[PDB]
Amino acid sequence: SFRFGQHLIKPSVVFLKTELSFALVNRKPVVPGHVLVCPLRPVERFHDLRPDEVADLFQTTQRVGTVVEKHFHGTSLTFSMQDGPEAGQTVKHVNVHVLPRKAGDWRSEEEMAAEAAALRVYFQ
Amino acid sequence: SFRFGQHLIKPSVVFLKTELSFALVNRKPVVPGHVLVCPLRPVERFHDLRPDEVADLFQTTQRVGTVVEKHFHGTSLTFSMQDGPEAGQTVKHVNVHVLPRKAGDWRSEEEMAAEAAALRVYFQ
Numbered sequence: 001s002f003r004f005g006q007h008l009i010k011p012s013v014v015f016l017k018t019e020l021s022f023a024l025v026n027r028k029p030v031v032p033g034h035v036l037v038c039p040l041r042p043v044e045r046f047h048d049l050r051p052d053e054v055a056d057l058f059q060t061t062q063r064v065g066t067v068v069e070k071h072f073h074g075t076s077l078t079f080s081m082q083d084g085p086e087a088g089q090t091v092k093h094v095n096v097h098v099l100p101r102k103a104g105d106w107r108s109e110e111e112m113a114a115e116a117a118a119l120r121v122y123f124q
Numbered sequence: 125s126f127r128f129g130q131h132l133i134k135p136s137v138v139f140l141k142t143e144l145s146f147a148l149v150n151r152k153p154v155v156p157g158h159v160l161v162c163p164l165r166p167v168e169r170f171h172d173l174r175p176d177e178v179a180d181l182f183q184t185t186q187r188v189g190t191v192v193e194k195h196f197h198g199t200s201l202t203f204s205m206q207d208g209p210e211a212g213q214t215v216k217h218v219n220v221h222v223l224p225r226k227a228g229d230w231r232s233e234e235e236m237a238a239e240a241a242a243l244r245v246y247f248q
């Protein structure tokens with residue numbers, strides 16, 4: 001019941017949801033704990049975001065990171081937004097990639113829902 | 125009169141300044157128009173930012189990008205924050221890297237002040 005470009009994201013893999021943004025797990029994380037934060041409204045370019053959704057997108061992005069860094073035992077975070085077709089954007093929806101980091105660094109929907117469930121505990 | 129870790133940034137190379145953040149040019153941009161946006165207060169990890177400075181850091185980051193994308197003729201933006209020593213952070217100050225993007229992609233302080241001056245026109 002979450003739009004992410006032209007796909008619908010089953011709540012099962014969504015682990016946080018604010019008034020304006022939401023965060024979810026990946027089918028192929030680049031690193032354990034690689035997750036995403038996207039505004040609820042489907043805009044394709046970061047510049048299309050009202051300034052309230054931008055505050056919200058990154059206050060949420062701040063929070064989500066503190067948790068996966070904890071949860072997945074990282075010591076540093078890597079944040080990044082691929083904003084446009086020439087920046088590598090594949091899904092035309094704004095979305096921050098949050099990747100926990102460590103010194104020297106595909107799955108089933110159920111493994112995704114398991115992971116989202118664990119992440120939901122930290123936002124309780 | 126701008127702190128960026130343990131260095132002082134001469135206003136000459138600063139091209140925007142809000143109540144909470146500020147943006148500046150690079151001595152070695154990775155791509156023409158690669159610039160930075162940093163909170164005025166020197167925190168070393170994104171999580172150390174109040175939520176007001178986070179709204180401000182990214183509302184500002186939204187603006188700055190729209191301009192360098194225009195100015196440097198890009199068609200897409202790449203945003204990214206290296207948050208921690210294991211994420212590649214070199215300067216222990218929070219700072220978003222904004223890089224304009226195009227299909228298939230060191231200088232003197234004066235060349236830096238020239239560039240900041242041009243960027244200041246778009247925020248007039």
Ligand SMILES: Nc1ncnc2c1ncn2[C@@H]1O[C@H](COP(=O)(O)CP(=O)(O)O[P@](=O)(S)OC[C@H]2O[C@@H](n3cnc4c(N)ncnc43)[C@H](O)[C@@H]2O)[C@@H](O)[C@H]1O
Nearest residue numbers: 007025026027078079080082088089090091095097099204
């Ligand atoms: N050395 C290094 N190597 C790699 N990354 C590094 C690095 N250093 C720093 N970084 C860091 O690693 C990041 C590089 O990641 P990236 O920007 O290359 C991933 P993307 O696939 O291009 O993303 P988008 O198209 S925008 O967004 C689409 C995303 O949503 C997901 N998605 C789409 N549909 C989905 C669905 N239905 N269900 C679940 N997920 C879906 C996709 O899997 C995809 O990840 C940077 O932040 C950098 O600082």
Ligand SMILES: Nc1ncnc2c1ncn2[C@@H]1O[C@H](COP(=O)(O)CP(=O)(O)O[P@](=O)(S)OC[C@H]2O[C@@H](n3cnc4c(N)ncnc43)[C@H](O)[C@@H]2O)[C@@H](O)[C@H]1O
Nearest residue numbers: 080131149150151202203204206212213214215219221223
């Ligand atoms: N294929 C690709 N290749 C490269 N980047 C890509 C990519 N695809 C996407 N990206 C994109 O390119 C970016 C990768 O850039 P990066 O994160 O590797 C640069 P950094 O030097 O590690 O940054 P920091 O330590 S955090 O911050 C320090 C910064 O402040 C500057 N600085 C420090 N002191 C200064 C001073 N006194 N005066 C002026 N500037 C100063 C430094 O030059 C430095 O750039 C990503 O956003 C990605 O999405």
